[PDB]
Design a protein around this ligand. Structure first.
Ligand SMILES: CCCCCCCCCCCCCCCCCCCC(=O)O[C@H](COC(=O)CCCCCCCCCCCCCC)COP(=O)(O)OCCN
Ligand SMILES: CCCCCCCCCCCCCCCCCCCC(=O)O[C@H](COC(=O)CCCCCCCCCCCCCC)COP(=O)(O)OCCN
Ligand SMILES: CC(=O)O[C@H]1C[C@@]2(C)[C@@H](C[C@@H](O)[C@H]3[C@@]4(C)CC[C@@H](O)[C@@H](C)[C@@H]4CC[C@@]32C)/C1=C(\CCC=C(C)C)C(=O)O
Ligand SMILES: CCCCCCCCCCCCO[C@@H]1O[C@H](CO)[C@@H](O[C@H]2O[C@H](CO)[C@@H](O)[C@H](O)[C@H]2O)[C@H](O)[C@H]1O
Ligand SMILES: CCCCCCCCCCCCO[C@@H]1O[C@H](CO)[C@@H](O[C@H]2O[C@H](CO)[C@@H](O)[C@H](O)[C@H]2O)[C@H](O)[C@H]1O
Ligand SMILES: CCCCCCCCCCCCO[C@@H]1O[C@H](CO)[C@@H](O[C@H]2O[C@H](CO)[C@@H](O)[C@H](O)[C@H]2O)[C@H](O)[C@H]1O
Ligand SMILES: CCCCCCCCCC(=O)OC[C@H](CO)OC(=O)CCCCCCCCC
Ligand SMILES: CCCCCCCCCC[N+](C)(C)[O-]
Ligand SMILES: CCCCCCCCCCCC
Ligand SMILES: CCCCCCCCCC
Ligand SMILES: CCCCCCCCCC
Ligand SMILES: CCCCCCCCCC
Ligand SMILES: CCCCCCCCCC
Ligand SMILES: CCCCCCCC
Ligand SMILES: CCCCCCCC
Ligand SMILES: CCCCCC
Ligand SMILES: CCCCCC
Lengths: 1034, 156, 144, 96, 48, 48
């Protein structure tokens, strides 16, 4: 094939042109994102039961749905929460590779059949089935500065005016509103109602009759009286449109003749649908839009498209309305692509400087400068066929492969240059010989490197997906590189490279390059003499090798293992947690403190604080809140002291002395739905209908035991809430029947007033919106207010609640959890420092077998996957090792020689572990993939030394030591040229402290460190491996 | 309230004997109560922590402490069938005939949940068998409606 | 034929018919299933100590085992060989007529007195200023 | 049933159309609301698009809107299915 | 009486059932026992 | 109709380059492709 394209350089050009155009097309048309879909498909069922408790939601909704979740394909597990905010959330997680559209329709179709089994109120609100995505492209905050609008007023504007236009924008997959559009809020008055002998029932009845769409018919409709001239639609009653119209609703006509209207017994205003979430931005009332990117969409294009939509929305904004960007992933993504792309261009520039240093002719510097980009462009074309996106993972998977790509180009050109200098052959004749020496080895390396990387794509779960991005990207580039190395570079080398006179090693030249040629030639002599002394005393270096292997195994165990390094993303969160039963106001007062702090003590770093009162990741309620802090540009936060890590720590400290509040700040993870490493997700299951209390006792018993093993387990805690005091009211059936009061009226009156009741819809300025009836705040605050509510008996007299009810305090669950249909309690925890996740999990498993009868357990989330991905690592490591041996066995035609190559692996890994350890880094995916690329190059270098040496012995009948010394002498230059260029190529990544430096540090540090040891050791150790192995097996 | 008062409430509820002990030594207010007016004795009487109940009563805990709805620790102990706590409380001067805001006595609740042993202890200490609630219902009336024959037999 | 899409297409049409059916037939639960006509296996459950009856076992299997098997991938249909327990009100017409009552009075009373009620909260949002109490109101619950 | 074009557009067509966003391979969406109160919302997709998967994506995104619709519209029923404009043939029937 | 989903693997489904039953057995009441009076999958394993 | 006409220029452009490079690869020349691709207007004017 090389020989074919040496005679046919135009063909080689055509293949290069076709690759360059195909790749160029792909690069502009490929989708740009931050991260691809890593997490498996999860379908979430969400419903609201207005004013329902945890148990009511669970017993009327959660259980009824779970029993109907049958006949759905590829379901792994099902988990649900039922809380006192009236919400249920049933999550169904599916097998990786499941069609999310099919999984969603199957779940949603089985729900539709369960709908008639649910309560009227739950059917009316609606049960939403959506696909799980915790990745927002950006959040667009909408504020109001002149204190004219409330958060409900701002939210209605955004719903009516902006939201739909943003949903219709190119690349926008989903838009979630932070709040609700207006709702017609009827705030009822028990005093006024009782005075006119009316109940919440009477108010609902009247709204339903006087706020409705009534079907009429037609004038001259078919079949008509033959001779009819006109046909017209009759328009009867239509829905109300204003607070004024709702206030005029007639409830009762008195005897004297005065009319009782809805405005007489209640306050009427356009309010929000619920008042649980109070959102404020830098103290001011706020709303906004959580925008998600669509499938196969460009994240930079969408972001630009959304900003241009908002830009032309501003003119029609009311007084004081402003758009703000607390969160946008686009600047961080645009930085990552650029720095990755910048590294590839610098890497090529660096080879030019290095190629010219050794070879000292501009024609030889162009062969790599042409060949490498063709492979890089060409790689994008292959990514496109795999249905991949330009993302941080693939962009860094490409940067990690530079050493392998740059080498393919250098190895081919250098060898042709060497041949022409040593044998004095013309360019075309020299290339044939030169390629004939390496054409078999290059193909052998492709097969070995494939066997290193291809197995990496067959890992399952979330982390198996992150590995597959690197696997395909690296394999695809390395495959194209070998193809280009056999097809294009031979043709260029035979047509472009100038001839060299035999024994011209540039010692005849003067100036700097004359010194360099004379310098490098002496150093090659010092080198070969040095290897000669090593090959006399081989047994010493074998002992020095086992010290490295033992030094490797130590650092490997000592080094902590994470998934992805944390990044200064210009944002982080402060979680606020007050005690159980704490009110909205109390939580608000702490969030106000937290905001003051960031805008006062951190006014140099912090741009905005988005304080959300009433929202918590561990469970909603009035006593929980999160403050999402948005910083300024990375340019205006210089040094490590003004970073998200440093601020996070200061903030957590300052809030440690907050009285009656658990307040701490923390950075966001690289991936949202990956959790942490050494972290586990335990599920305690009620398998024998014990109850909630007996399961709590069992959880408490398991937690107490876990706390006596601080050396194995640390931070073993429940994920859910604790039992809170609740107000139990017993309706007396006998007294109710005696007084002539119906239970339906009692139940409606209490639920409507205290809980709120969704009656029907109305059209507010051409938008259908909801109508709620609820008690005015001051009449549904305390137990004393219960007896202030009256129900009308059949005989007409008004009966207070006090007459037919009795109340007491008890304890009940504000958040009831279920796992796989049964009651459950999620326990989070992690392995103690120096313990593997499997150790901790076997202990939790052991402690759990000693729990009360009818208490089971199970692993979910990451721990479910770990158990499955842990069974695979053995098979893939094993398969990978066997195929490398086999590929090297076919190349060398020896069962034994392959060992000489395979023995180089630790030489690259030792430096990696040293650099990582001394910089204070972790065993993260970037480091791990960097090990594979370091091993590949060091293994590639070793392969050509053994091949050169072996063919001398086989073809020129040279001696073992003679062939080895000649081999390493010939490979010294190209090895040093790749390393010099590549080490300089990744040097900026190690020292980079800017935006996205976390990822760059993980790539650069473990590569530079590994490249230094793999270069210095391998040139001395490969000759030792080859000689010791050949001596063992004749 | 106080700092240690909240720790005692949370500790007395969980049944953490060794934390309650340290708190009693440090002088944590035993008369500390949450929003609903539940003292550490209520929480110990409710969740059935006998050892702590005894410790609180020793440390000058109000045995006839009532909540915002007028319920005592004996109301809770009698309702959730904690026989030992009931006896300990009655021993330390718990009002056997304590009515709540509904006129419900510890006997009414013991009868309703059908705790036969507890009903006899209250009766031993002089529970008014003819005590009526806000609806004129005695402990006998509850047993007959509940259909508990054994309990109806004890109240003649 | 893609059975997934056949189930989706069939059910899409059934969903138009669903509202036209009697309330009683909707409340029993209509089921669209894509299974084989023949049994893969029969998971029999007996009591070796003879402590549980045919009815007791059947209820255990329905209430503890049946749903998890039904949710297992590849299980097109699960047929219980028995019945899950219900709260059985066996009416006496002699005693009904004596107190001048009917099955309508019985049904209506079970609905009023076997009800799980959404009763709201004390100090719920939007609250008054200086509110210190936040508690769920628990009214009637399902009978056990 | 019984509602005018504008009443039906405000309550059904717009409510549904708002939820017809972020669907794979959607070229355009034409729709109309008539005096009788019928609502047809035709979503035409790219050539080569799997019509069965296209149907599933439309059905899932519609059923989010379904509860926001009037309850009288829900009782009358809402269908999602593959469609074509022109008739293949008209099979006429007469009496001799 | 378990029926197999259209086009599903009988052996892989039967394996998954016996796996789900294995997690229930531990929490059975006293006396309860699983018996296999009918199974078509055992024949396929032997015939192969 | 709009779509069809918008993309026709790109279709002719790429088709010519493919035919060009295919000849260069097959005949190992630049001049033979250049010589052959100059006849394309002689054909296209006849069709117009
Ligand atoms: C000795 C010399 C040579 C010997 C060995 C040579 C081996 C390689 C040379 C042969 C090249 C042939 C390439 C055939 C590719 C087969 C796969 C077809 C593509 C496919 O099914 O994927 C979909 C393509 O759909 C689409 O329509 C999306 C666009 C992607 C289509 C692929 C076009 C890009 C270029 C592919 C050719 C690569 C060769 C370059 C060297 C998914 O994609 P999607 O619809 O999800 O789109 C989102 C993109 N992220
Ligand atoms: C729709 C989107 C639009 C985008 C447009 C995309 C652009 C398409 C690119 C098309 C590629 C065309 C490149 C052709 C280069 C022609 C070189 C001229 C040389 C020339 O005429 O001399 C020949 C000899 O050259 C020799 O002696 C051999 C010279 C070899 C050097 C080749 C240099 C290739 C540079 C390629 C650049 C890449 C372009 C970007 C993709 C003639 O003699 P003969 O050999 O024919 O006759 C044999 C007789 N015994
Ligand atoms: C000059 C330099 O540094 O590189 C610039 C130059 C750059 C490599 C550009 C990205 C990309 O179009 C490049 C290709 C290969 C794209 C495909 C073809 O059309 C080529 C003819 C073109 C030439 C170089 C170019 C135009 C750069 C980028 C990418 C910026 C992207 C983001 C998301 C911020 C970059 O600056 O990083
Ligand atoms: C020497 C060989 C090296 C080969 C390196 C090739 C890799 C190139 C990486 C891909 C980046 C190019 O891809 C393209 O970048 C431009 C950036 O102007 C993006 O452009 C988009 O984002 C930018 C972000 O500021 C917006 O201002 C712009 O309005 C929008 O169109 C495209 O959405 C993206 O598709
Ligand atoms: C099933 C897929 C996996 C298979 C494993 C792949 C690993 C093997 C890598 C490629 C091996 C290349 O194999 C090698 O090729 C070249 C060209 O044919 C040969 O090289 C030789 O060719 C001829 C002999 O035909 C000689 O005159 C010449 O001196 C020399 O160049 C080697 O004798 C052969 O061993
Ligand atoms: C400590 C940080 C440095 C890290 C990188 C270092 C790893 C590579 C070290 C190899 C350096 C070469 O070290 C080489 O060793 C051999 C002996 O082993 C010496 O050889 C010397 O001893 C041998 C026998 O032991 C004699 O036969 C020989 O005549 C004598 O010269 C070479 O003269 C010396 O050049
Ligand atoms: C050259 C001879 C074989 C080289 C090693 C081959 C191992 C490849 C197995 C594989 O698929 O990697 C996946 C793996 C997931 O954890 O990725 C990685 O973790 C990176 C590689 C780990 C380094 C171990 C080898 C060095 C110890 C002496
Ligand atoms: C895609 C380019 C096609 C490659 C064709 C290479 C032909 C190699 C001929 C082998 N041979 C030993 C006969 O020379
Ligand atoms: C699930 C989609 C993956 C499709 C894989 C196709 C890969 C073919 C590309 C081969 C080009 C060399
Ligand atoms: C998940 C299985 C992916 C198959 C591996 C593809 C490797 C080929 C790269 C060119
Ligand atoms: C002459 C042998 C052809 C080389 C094959 C290269 C394919 C790379 C596969 C990863
Ligand atoms: C005393 C040790 C001798 C080492 C000299 C080797 C030089 C190698 C340059 C690459
Ligand atoms: C399964 C890995 C292949 C190992 C074969 C080695 C054979 C060597 C004996 C001569
Ligand atoms: C995760 C599915 C990928 C399967 C494609 C196989 C490529 C050869
Ligand atoms: C006499 C030993 C000198 C070795 C010099 C090597 C230069 C890098
Ligand atoms: C070349 C390696 C194949 C990997 C299959 C798991
Ligand atoms: C209409 C322009 C066609 C382009 C030919 C190169």
């Amino acid at each position: 094939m090389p020989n074919f394209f040496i005679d046919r350089p135009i063909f080689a050009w055509v293949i290069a042109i076709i690759i360059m155009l195909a790749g160029g097309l792909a690069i502009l048309k490929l989708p740009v994102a931050q991260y691809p879909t890593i997490a498996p498909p999860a379908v979430t069922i969400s419903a609201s039961y207005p004013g329902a408790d945890a148990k009511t939601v669970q017993d009327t909704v959660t259980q009824v749905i779970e029993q109907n979740m049958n006949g759905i394909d590829n379901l792994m597990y099902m988990s649900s929460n039922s809380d006192s905010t009236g919400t249920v959330q049933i999550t169904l997680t599916f097998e990786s590779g499941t069609d999310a559209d099919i999984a969603q329709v199957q779940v949603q179709n089985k729900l539709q059949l369960a709908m008639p089994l649910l309560p009227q109120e739950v059917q009316q609100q609606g049960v939403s089935v959506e696909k799980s995505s915790s990745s927002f492209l950006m959040v667009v905050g909408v504020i109001n500065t002149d204190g004219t609008m409330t958060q409900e007023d701002i939210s209605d504007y955004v719903a009516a005016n902006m939201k739909d236009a943003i949903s219709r924008t190119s690349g926008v997959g989903d838009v979630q509103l932070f709040g609700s559009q207006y709702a017609m809020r009827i705030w009822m008055n028990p005093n006024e109602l009782n005075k006119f002998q009316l109940t919440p029932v009477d108010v609902i009845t009247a709204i339903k009759a006087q706020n409705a769409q009534v079907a009429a018919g037609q004038l001259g409709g078919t079949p008509p009286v033959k001779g009819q001239q006109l046909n017209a639609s009759i328009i009867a009653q239509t829905r109300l449109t204003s607070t004024e119209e709702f206030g005029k609703i007639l409830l009762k006509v008195n005897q004297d003749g005065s009319r009782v209207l809805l405005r007489d017994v209640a306050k009427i205003e356009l309010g929000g649908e619920n008042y649980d979430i109070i959102a404020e931005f830098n103290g001011q009332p706020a709303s906004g839009l959580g925008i998600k990117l669509a499938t196969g969409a460009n994240a930079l294009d969408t972001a630009a498209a959304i900003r241009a939509e908002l830009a032309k929305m501003e003119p029609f904004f009311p007084s004081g309305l402003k758009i703000v960007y607390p969160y946008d992933t686009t600047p961080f993504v645009k930085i990552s692509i650029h720095e990755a792309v910048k590294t590839l261009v610098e890497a090529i520039i660096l080879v030019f400087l290095v190629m010219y240093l050794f070879l000292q002719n501009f024609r030889a510097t162009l062969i790599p400068t042409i060949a490498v980009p063709v492979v890089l462009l060409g790689t994008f074309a292959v990514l496109a066929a795999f249905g991949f996106s330009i993302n941080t993972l693939t962009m860094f998977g490409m940067v990690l492969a530079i050493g392998l790509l740059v080498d393919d180009a250098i190895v081919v050109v250098e060898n042709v240059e060497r041949v022409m200098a040593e044998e004095g052959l013309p360019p075309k004749e020299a290339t044939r010989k030169s390629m004939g020496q390496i054409q078999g080895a290059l193909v052998g390396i492709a097969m070995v490197l494939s066997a290193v990387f291809v197995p990496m794509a067959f890992f399952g779960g979330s982390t198996g997906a992150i590995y597959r991005q690197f696997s395909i990207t690296i394999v695809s580039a390395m495959a194209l590189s070998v193809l280009v190395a056999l097809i294009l570079t031979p043709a260029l080398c035979a047509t472009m490279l100038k001839p060299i006179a035999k024994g011209d090693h540039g010692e005849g030249k003067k100036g700097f390059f004359g010194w360099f040629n004379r310098m490098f030639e002496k150093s090659t002599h010092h080198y070969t003499d040095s290897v000669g002394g090593i090959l006399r005393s081989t047994g010493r270096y074998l002992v020095l090798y086992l010290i490295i292997v033992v030094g490797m195994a130590y650092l490997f165990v000592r080094l902590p293992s994470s998934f992805l390094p944390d990044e200064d993303q210009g944002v982080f969160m402060t979680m606020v947690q007050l005690p159980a039963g704490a009110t909205q106001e109390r939580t608000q007062k702490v969030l106000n403190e937290v905001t003051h702090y960031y805008l006062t003590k951190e006014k140099n770093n912090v741009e905005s604080v988005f304080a959300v009162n009433g929202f918590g990741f561990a469970g909603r309620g009035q006593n929980t809140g999160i403050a999402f802090v948005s910083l300024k540009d990375w340019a205006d936060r210089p040094g490590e002291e003004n970073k998200v890590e440093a601020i996070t720590m200061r903030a957590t400290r300052a809030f440690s002395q907050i009285k009656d509040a658990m307040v701490f700040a923390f950075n966001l993870p690289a991936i949202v739905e990956l959790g942490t490493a050494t972290g586990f997700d335990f599920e305690l299951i009620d398998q024998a209908g014990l109850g909630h209390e007996k399961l709590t006792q069992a959880r408490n018993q398991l937690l107490a035991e876990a706390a006596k093993h601080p050396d194995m387990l640390t931070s073993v805690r429940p994920n859910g809430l604790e039992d809170t005091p609740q107000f139990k009211i017993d309706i007396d059936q006998e007294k109710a029947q005696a007084l002539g009061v119906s239970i339906n009226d009692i139940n409606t009156t209490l639920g409507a007033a205290w809980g709120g009741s969704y009656v029907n819809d109305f059209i507010d300025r051409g938008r259908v919106k909801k109508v709620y009836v609820m008690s005015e705040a001051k009449y549904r605050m305390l137990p004393d207010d219960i007896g202030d509510w009256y129900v009308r008996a059949a005989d007409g007299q008004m009966v207070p609640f006090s007459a037919f009810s009795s109340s007491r305090w008890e304890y009940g669950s504000p958040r009831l959890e279920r796992y796989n249909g049964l009651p459950s309690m999620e326990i989070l925890g992690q392995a103690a420092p120096g313990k593997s996740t499997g150790e901790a999990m076997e202990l939790m498993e052991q402690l759990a077998s000693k729990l009360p009868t009818g208490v089971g357990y199970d692993w979910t989330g990451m721990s479910y996957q770990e158990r499955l991905s842990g069974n695979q690592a053995p098979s893939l490591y094993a398969i990978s090792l066997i195929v490398v041996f086999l590929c090297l066995a076919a190349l060398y035609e020896s069962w034994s020689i392959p060992f000489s190559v395979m023995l180089v692996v630790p030489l690259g890994v030792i430096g990696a572990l040293l650099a990582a350890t001394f910089r204070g880094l972790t065993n993260d995916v970037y480091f791990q993939v960097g090990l594979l690329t370091t091993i590949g190059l060091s293994a590639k270098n070793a392969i050509l030394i053994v091949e050169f040496a072996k063919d001398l012995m086989d073809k020129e009948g040279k001696g073992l030591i003679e062939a080895t010394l000649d081999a390493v002498r010939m490979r010294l230059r190209p090895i040093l040229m790749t390393s010099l260029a590549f080490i300089l190529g990744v040097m900026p990544l190690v020292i980079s402290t800017g935006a996205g430096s976390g990822a760059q540090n993980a790539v650069g540090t473990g590569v530079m460190g590994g490249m230094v040891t793999a270069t210095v050791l391998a040139i001395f150790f490969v000759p030792v491996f080859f000689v010791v192995v050949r001596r063992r097996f004749s | 309230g106080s700092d240690l008062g909240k720790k005692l409430l949370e500790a007395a509820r969980a049944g953490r004997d060794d934390e309650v002990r340290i708190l009693m030594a440090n002088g944590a207010d035993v008369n500390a109560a949450d929003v609903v007016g539940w003292t550490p004795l209520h929480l110990a009487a409710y969740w059935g922590h006998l050892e702590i109940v005894e410790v609180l009563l020793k440390n000058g805990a109000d045995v006839n402490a009532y909540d915002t709805l007028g319920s005592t620790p004996l109301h809770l102990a009698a309702h959730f069938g904690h026989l030992e706590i009931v006896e300990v409380l009655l021993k330390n001067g718990a009002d056997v005939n304590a009515k709540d805001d509904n006129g419900i006595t510890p006997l009414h609740l013991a009868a309703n949940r059908g705790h036969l042993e507890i009903v006899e202890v209250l009766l031993k200490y002089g529970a008014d068998v003819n005590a009526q609630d806000k609806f004129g219902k005695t402990a006998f009336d509850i047993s007959i409606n509940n259909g508990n024959e054994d309990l109806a037999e004890i109240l003649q």
